[PDB]
Subunit: 214 residues, 5 copies
């Protein structure tokens, strides 16, 4: 029965995914009538490089994203008590969380796979290398340099996508201990932006990093 | 449940526009299109005097209008606009005419479509282009220029316009290595030897110097 | 509306429908006209003897399978289409050192007589010793372009002129062009029984002074 | 005979792949062990300006799925076959402290054996976080990098090594850097993100300038 | 005339029909097996040593790799297809061997169109041009005798009992070597070897490319 249990668990998961993905149309993304709140958090692993000839700095971090869709809900009892599953991020809608002052395309360092839970909640944690606009002047001093970069939806205003953080402290517990740069402070703060282009406000999380040469 | 219906209406709308009608074949002499173009310059990242290439980060505002993208909000739950993958729709082949590397795309390829058939698409880009930065370390600074326009469509198929001749500098990076003295964007009509029909472009002209 | 419908119908008739063109053959050979418009010598690297050019490449050919009567399609005489929608020649630099980087949209123009025009802009790194670039005489380098897999029995080449177009060459390049020629050649590679055709691009250049 | 052998191989691959949906990956109810081993070929570059080191290696991965089992007697005595990695499930084994996307240096083709076991040996170049200070001394420099599933906890994917010794028998003899030691060690981690423990294999390399 | 126009049409039809008969109404070759092994002929044409990096001991080559093999499943009778004796086809339409450099340090960069030639006897010719970075210590390159480096090419996943290799000559073709390269070639050979790797009881086959080169004076 126990290998049949294994076969049944696979059948159940295959069925769940078919039901969620093949027998319901793809979620069209958030709208003003159906807005979404994405929870964003950063785990900073390394400041790899600080280029004073171009004022670009390169970070490596894990970006934790979480949201919840009614359309991704199921009753575990209908599917052999499955409460969550992993799936390619290509299979589901994902928010267009973008750095606002990048100078190169982000490079993805991890597999793009999300965890979907039966309450319709999704957790997706892409590791990234980012080059962004930053003047490292002062990095070779006790006080160090300070740079900042905003992350938010590119195409969705606050009326479609809102953001939140669970804390305003960037997680430094995994920061590389032999980095060329030591972290003096790293914060992540929700902001409401008004851009002259657009009558609607855009929400971002402002990552502010203060750092110096070790 | 109202949220469920809103979703159905939007899915229904996109299906009607995209699955139940063939994608537009692009503009023609009999159905020409005007694309409105504007630039927001964010950074002059690098100026390489060994190769005379300069690297810009900007975003390009593109807007156009297609009758084939129109709908009556009243028959789709009063949906007035939606976001969609740029792959779902026709987009103009707006190209720099003096790039030295392929453009690097810095923003999601997603457009906004409105019920009157208008489309807005705002790609952010890093561009290397032909530019001699001689004088950048002087009070007068350096001046370079780069033309943007359709690669394959003449002025008889795609016209361009700008809403202003001033490049938007309000988001220019205040700690760039280079400060901007001026940045203009100006529609030009060109007659190239190759071709009997005039081509249209927007000439981005930037005057910049080493920040002091 | 009518014009749009006419163009969709034409493309559908040509593509979605009529039997397919499988590329040229000995029994159905093709001539491709090639020309170059040199825009910039970006870089000359004397440590590796590689030089980087930016140019566009004008390609032209004609297929009976792409012909139509404008009168049957509301007097449409040409259209733009994705290069992926049609056959295109495998024109290749014979001495590149890096993959070509494409700088322009991959879209071609098809005309009612069956002619296709395709003008890809490229950045190319190729084998070139720039020795002498810092002298009055300058350096000279050459690179051959032609089909990779089709011999002259399947693809022949020609030029409309042997002068490279320099009328868009960047006036403030690090390098001045002294001359640039594009010349059809016939190659007989001991590798292969049939002759290969190429257009040889020869560029004489020097540091701007 | 040859046409028969081919027809049989085609039939097997059909019955296995196109005659069920791809396996949905491991779960707590249907967990998997990946055996992981490294063969280090070269330390290409050590950058003391950014503290990044570049390694070239082969990563040996092995796992077993009941759903990939067959009776060779039903398929003309076929006991194993090669197939594109895209045709089958593969584990999301990831370096935890890379600084650039891994670059794949070998074909993405696996070997499947009739007992359901799969062997997949991707060659990679990896840049990862490493301070090379001391590389020009007798004791050399030591760096480490953890490899593990990105999204599956130890309750879904276990890892194991057959040996804690990295295979150095193909290490490039004229590298800029010589290897003093290289070990690969299973670890269990408890991350605040996640209630369930994660498993990794920690690669520790001690290296020095080859003089 | 009209006859000539028709002949061309018939030729196009005949080729489309041949490709369809081979590719559409037939199963893609599942690759070689111990029961159905395959011999691939490999040869190199070295065009340039582009660079020699003594800071990392990587050297970069540009070459053409000629590959040839033959399958019964690609055979046809030309008389059944208007005397068509060969055709060009995308390398994606056919099976191709996984010939790989065994000491690359970067992914190979492909410099030519991925198109093969298939002949009515079932033989296939495929000639990818590549830029390769590989492990090579160029110490001595500034000497009369130069530096020597080597790199093995072979199937990644198939042993010698599935994919065997051969050369047609022991000499790398230097007839189109770049005359103004930074490096002159002193010799370049290509030699079949048999390897025994601890992973696997079956022997593996490779062709070893050995190049002796020096800075041009
Ligand atoms: C598609 O293309 C063709 C063009 O080749 C086009 O067909 C042409 O239509 C024009 C306009 O009707 C025709 O021109 C006429 O020719 C006759 C002689 O045959 C003249 O008598 C006509 O002149 C009178 O009418 C003019 C107004 O139309 C007056 O200005 C003038 O004073 C005269 O009263 C006129 O020039 C022409 O014959 C055809 N040509 C062919 C080859 O058919 C067709 O109309 C185009 N299709 C569309 C939808 O536009
Ligand atoms: C007149 O100049 C502009 C400048 C920027 C934007 C859009 C922006 C910039 C702020 C971030 N998001 C957007 C956006 C909004 C919707 C789709 N794509 C991009 C614009 O569109 C209305 C016009
Ligand atoms: C010397 O002979 C030539 C030179 C250039 C072009 C095209 C150009 C030049 C630059 C503007 N864009 C085009 C174009 C036109 C149509 C398709 N693709 C590109 C040409 O074709 C009409 C012939
Ligand atoms: C000096 O020795 C040579 C010369 C030429 C070629 C091939 C060529 C010439 C360049 C254009 N294409 C080919 C080709 C020929 C057949 C199939 N694929 C490619 C060659 O291939 C191994 C060796
Ligand atoms: C110190 O802060 C940490 C530590 C570990 C992880 C996740 C990891 C560890 C590496 C393996 N994969 C994951 C993971 C876990 C869940 C989903 N996706 C990825 C993390 O995510 C934000 C923060
Ligand atoms: C010294 O340690 C070694 C030697 C050889 C191989 C495999 C090789 C040799 C190169 C060609 N391909 C393979 C291979 C074999 C089987 C499956 N996939 C790849 C190896 O893989 C972990 C370690
Ligand atoms: C759209 O709005 C109009 C008035 O604003 C209303 O009469 C109509 O019911 C709405 N149509 C819908 C929701 O389909």
């Amino acid at each position: 029965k126990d290998d049949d249990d294994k076969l049944h668990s696979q059948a159940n998961l295959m069925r769940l995914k078919s039901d969620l993905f093949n027998r319901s149309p793809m979620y069209p993304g958030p709208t003003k009538d159906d807005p979404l709140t994405v929870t964003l958090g950063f785990t900073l692993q390394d400041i790899v490089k600080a280029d004073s000839s171009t004022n670009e700095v390169d970070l490596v971090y894990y970006e934790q994203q979480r949201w919840k869709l009614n359309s991704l809900m199921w009753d575990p009892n209908e599917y052999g008590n499955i409460t969550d599953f992993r799936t390619s991020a290509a299979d589901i809608w994902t928010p267009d969380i973008t750095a606002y002052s990048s100078t190169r395309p982000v490079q993805v360092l991890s597999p793009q796979i999300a965890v979907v839970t039966h309450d319709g909640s999704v957790m997706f944690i892409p590791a990234q290398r980012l080059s962004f606009m930053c003047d490292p002047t002062g990095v070779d001093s006790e006080e160090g340099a300070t740079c900042a970069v905003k992350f938010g939806s590119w195409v969705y205003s606050g009326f479609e996508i809102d953001l939140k953080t669970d804390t305003d402290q960037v997680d430094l517990s995994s920061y590389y201990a032999s980095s060329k740069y030591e972290i003096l402070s790293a914060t992540q703060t929700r902001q409401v932006q008004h851009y002259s282009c657009c009558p609607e406000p855009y929400i971002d999380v402002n990552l502010v990093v203060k750092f110096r040469e070790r």
